[PDB]
Structure formats: C-alpha cells, structure tokens
Design a binder for these strands. Structure first.
Ligand SMILES: [Mn+2]
Ligand SMILES: [Mn+2]
Ligand code: NA
Ligand code: NA
Length: 327
DNA sequence: CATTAGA
DNA sequence: TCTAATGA
C-alpha cells in the first residue's frame, strides 16, 4: 500500500505504456500481475531477487526493480515520459471517444495536438466530435449543488411522461459525494421486466422529453436500452452559462432494478465486500440478481427483490445508507 | 462484460 | 461481421 508503492507504481506506468503506445498486450499484461503481486507482498522488497521469487516476477521486471531501487528512477520510464510520440498517444486519448487505436492512427497521420484535432474534424466520428467539442467541460467535476439541479429536473420529466417510471440517480452523488464526474440515471418501469419483450419506446420517450425541454443537447449513443449523451442546465439569467455534462440513462427490467441500483451505487469496495459476504451467507450477487447458493458447488433461482433492503435482508446485513456505502 | 457505432 | 470505445 505504501511500502510497495514505487514498485507497483512504475509497474503500472510500465504496463500502461505497453498497451497504449505499443500493441503489446502481453508484456502489458505482464507488468500487471507483477504489480498486482508485489502490491500484495507484506514486506519492503529490497532487490530484484527478493521480488524475483514471486509468481509473475521474472528476470525482466526484477531487472527493472534494482535500477529503480538503486537509482530512484528508470531509463525506459525516463525515455517514455519524454517520448513526444507516446506523449501524444496518452493525450489524444482523453478525448471522449478517442482510444489508443485511434490515438495511434491520428498520431501517425500527424494529429498530435488538439488543434490538429480541430483542423481535422472530418477525420473524426460523431462521438469524438462531440468529445472534442466539450473537451473542456468534460474534464471538469460536477458540483453536487448542480447535481441536485440536474436530478431535480430529470425526475420531473420522467414523471411527466408517465407517472409509472421509477428513477434513481446512482453513483457517488447518491452516496453523498461532494462532486461527481457524470450523472447516472437508472431507470425502470413496471411494464418492463425480464420476459415481456421490451418496449424500446420506454427509453425513447424519456430521452425525447429530456431533449424536449432542452436538457440533453446531444446524443453520444442512443440505443434500445442505454442512452449516452450530454446535458446542460439552463444558463439562468445570463452572465453564467452551464458546462456540458455527460449523462447516461439506462432502462431496466423492473424485476432487477435494486440489484442494479445497488450495484451502480457502489462503492467499488462496498460492493465487493458485500458480494464477498452474500457468499458465506449462502448466496450470489451480481449486477442483476441475487441467487441462493447450493452445495454441489453452484446453484440458480433468482430471489425476489423489492428494495435495496430485500437484498440486505437476504444476506442478512445491516441496512447501510448510500452515504455509508463507502467500503 | 455488455452494449452501441461504424465500416 | 468484427473491432473500437464507454462504462462500471
Ligand atoms: Mn457515468
Ligand atoms: Mn458516474
Ligand atoms: Na518467480
Ligand atoms: Na478516450
């Protein structure tokens, strides 16, 4: 956690670099187990060898260790960090929509900068177009103060269209979070569950409405169950306009809301931990349901859930408010 | 790990 | 169809 810090650190630096600049999934994949392990190791690793003893730690990595323990540096790391080429790849990458593959490609073509990114807006797909567009506003945090406004709104329309829709703004915001990266609305409806062959319009109506009133200003990807866009709160009585925000809304078969909600609510560890728990308690929990476990090793049969509670009850736990789902 | 764009 | 990118 701190004792093995630098090690795993350059380690992740290293892996992340393969997979991005290089198409070296393996080596990249290497660096990670190693980093994974040394990370777990209970003692200050003092030299290649020591480390070396570990599963996943080869002569290659071990080699880097020493260099690193001897000199609090690494050439490859010093050389990469410099590399204008791989710098570019790391950078272009931030663009919402740009990934390594494309990061490379642009680079090759010679699109290194954001300005390059502009002059060549043609070479970019819509995703990335918007991605380039709201580049600033994308990178910014979302004041809870604003979250409340946004949430306030979504809620309204959702209801306006059909009183029957149920909505939940999940993620950190739900968990208290003084800020947030983007809003996650989870949605469901009674008419929609496990069997009943969809009703695509379900998602649809909603989006249409959101845009209807001008909340959603763009579409990143509307699909039959996952919309993915951009929103913005009405810029009041001018002088101060609102930053474009990522928004995601997903339709859910009513008979799986809570688990999903539970899930998306996090935190990542509370989740795990909870998950890890359901298990001893003789169960299974995942993004959509919760199943009683059986001795033969495994089992099925999706237990009924009416609220975050039910889930808790099941594994017989203490109801924990979103606020304290921190871990 | 699954859902959407795109080509 | 596959192959990218998001997310989480
Ligand atoms: Mn999100
Ligand atoms: Mn989020
Ligand atoms: Na070893
Ligand atoms: Na990106």
């Amino acid at each position: 956690e701190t004792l093995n810090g630098g090690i795993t650190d350059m380690l992740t630096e290293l892996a992340n670099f393969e997979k991005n600049v290089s198409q070296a999934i393996h080596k990249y994949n290497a660096y990670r187990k190693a980093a994974s392990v040394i990370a777990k190791y209970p003692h200050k690793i003092k030299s290649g060898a020591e480390a070396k003893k570990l599963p996943g730690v080869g002569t290659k990595i071990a080699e880097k260790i020493d260099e690193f323990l001897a000199t609090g540096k690494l050439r490859k790391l010093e050389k990469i960090r410099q590399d204008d080429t791989s710098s570019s790849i790391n950078f272009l990458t931030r663009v919402s929509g740009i990934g390594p593959s494309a990061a490379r490609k642009f680079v090759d073509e010679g699109i290194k900068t954001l300005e390059d990114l502009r002059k060549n807006e043609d070479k970019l797909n819509h995703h990335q177009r918007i991605g380039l567009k709201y580049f600033g506003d994308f990178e910014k945090r979302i004041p809870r103060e604003e979250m409340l406004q946004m949430q306030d709104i979504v809620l309204n329309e959702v209801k306006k269209v059909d009183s029957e829709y149920i909505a939940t703004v999940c993620g950190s915001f739900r968990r208290g979070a003084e800020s947030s990266g983007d809003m996650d609305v989870l949605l469901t409806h009674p008419s929609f569950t496990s069997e009943s062959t969809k009703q695509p319009k379900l998602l649809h109506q909603v989006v249409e409405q959101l845009q209807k009133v001008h909340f959603i200003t763009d579409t990143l990807s509307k699909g039959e169950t996952k919309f993915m866009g951009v929103c913005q709160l009405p810029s009041k009585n001018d002088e101060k306009e609102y930053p474009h925000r990522r928004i995601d809304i997903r339709l859910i078969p009513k008979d799986q809301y809570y688990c999903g909600v539970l899930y998306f609510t996090g935190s990542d560890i509370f989740n795990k931990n909870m998950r890890a728990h359901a298990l001893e308690k003789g169960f299974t929990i995942n993004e959509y349901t919760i199943r009683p476990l059986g001795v033969t090793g495994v089992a099925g049969e999706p237990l009924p859930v009416d609220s975050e509670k039910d889930i808790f009850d099941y594994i017989q736990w203490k109801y924990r408010e979103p606020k304290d789902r921190s871990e």
